[PDB]
Symmetry: C2
Subunit: 256 residues, 2 copies
């Protein structure tokens, strides 16, 4: 119903893109074209809570929201998946022109084509999902992204993905606050998994990000306790009349 | 991005329904109201390949498609999830009035409220997903559905879910033909998992259903080889000009 359609749509989209810009050419452009990446790692490990805002096209007002986010948050995620979310390379290009913050490309990134393409489109980082990559494929894509000067946000969902992830040298880990077995979106997830991080994680420049289930001041206080360095926000920042004030308040609750 | 939104939407929808029809009342109606269920089990274990067609509202022509499906397929799945797919109790009611085939309610069924509600709405079976139910909750909902005269289609995705499922007495198992680690939708999945079914599975009235990745005659021949009793179809039957001919041809390829 859901997972099977996401997979088949993505394979067809990849074939549609590879037709327009062939893979050997996309690789050529990534290697030849000049772009200094804006460091996501530096923006996420700065003291205090870092905020990552998400740009979704669906599930000009955009120029305004970009300007608001530019003054409020620390990095931007752009969703380029096309069938479920109506993203596109053009959408990312549009936002890239209008912000100096680090951009993370969010997509189902399973192919080196998409890593080269991320570099070409001006992303500073990509999202890799442990659940849809075996260990060989993950290491390949992870290494290629860093060879291009990109950071990588690694999404984990449970204890063995985290284990796999730490076992593969990962430095930026995002935990989704979902618990499928209780059909719940709660910080109880990050809390249990964060406890399994080694004590040297932050010391060795490890970065912990979370997404989902945080909306109250008490929620934010739980993050600091857990060693979360950054929070990824979707609708809460889209719907806020005053994103800068919301971020400022979250950061104060975190720091105090 | 995806999983967290599906979970939060579903919890809010459940609260919206419980407000209109409280749970104690929904239970009263399920127990008091008269309905003889149409046996899904009998329709799926009849000799040959059984076809289950899916009614999705999104992702009157409907009256026509129902009539076409009534002459072609062996059971109907109705998606009642509202936020991702635009289903509704009304949608199920509408289809129920117009078909004598067994109906499976497809939703994220995590609450006995939804099992009682399925009975009230005229479903003959419900869908339970191993991945989003712990063993206590699964057994409760599985047992309640059968106490109401409903069948249960149990969705499994990997080897330990199947193990869990067989360990809980399940009789109708649906395998989704997805492989997350290779980001593929393929019968290679059902084939590997079907091999792990005990030899007594079919003898003890076990029923194996698959969904996804089958579209060619060779695909269909792989199903029989694997002991698949039924195939669940979505777009292939929606888009067919002649569903009865498509089903007839699939059934011939299976039987020969």
């Amino acid at each position: 119903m859901i997972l099977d359609k996401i997979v088949e749509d993505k394979k067809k989209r990849l074939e549609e893109h590879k037709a327009k810009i062939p893979p050997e050419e996309m690789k050529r452009m990534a290697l030849e074209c000049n772009r200094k990446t804006i460091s996501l790692a530096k923006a996420l490990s700065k003291p205090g809570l870092s905020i990552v805002a998400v740009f979704l096209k669906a599930s000009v007002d955009l120029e305004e929201r970009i300007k608001q986010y530019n003054e409020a948050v620390d990095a931007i995620t752009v969703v380029t998946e096309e069938d479920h979310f109506q993203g596109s390379p053009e959408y990312l290009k549009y936002i890239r022109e209008r912000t100096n913050l680090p951009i993370i490309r969010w997509d189902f990134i399973i192919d080196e084509y998409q890593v080269y393409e991320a570099k070409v489109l001006g992303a500073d980082a990509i999202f890799l999902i442990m659940a849809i990559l075996d260990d060989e494929t993950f290491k390949r894509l992870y290494d290629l992204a860093y060879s291009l000067g990109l950071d990588v946000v690694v999404l984990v969902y449970d204890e063995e993905e985290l284990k796999r992830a730490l076992n593969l040298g990962v430095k930026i880990i995002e935990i989704m606050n979902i618990n499928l077995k209780t059909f719940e979106v709660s910080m109880d997830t990050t809390k249990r998994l964060a406890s399994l991080l080694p004590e040297e994680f932050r010391k060795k420049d490890g970065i912990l990000m979370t997404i989902g289930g945080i909306s109250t001041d008490e929620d934010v206080k739980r993050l600091k306790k857990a060693g979360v360095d950054a929070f990824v926000i979707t609708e809460a920042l889209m719907e806020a009349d005053n994103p800068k004030e919301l971020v400022k308040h979250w950061k104060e609750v975190y720091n105090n």
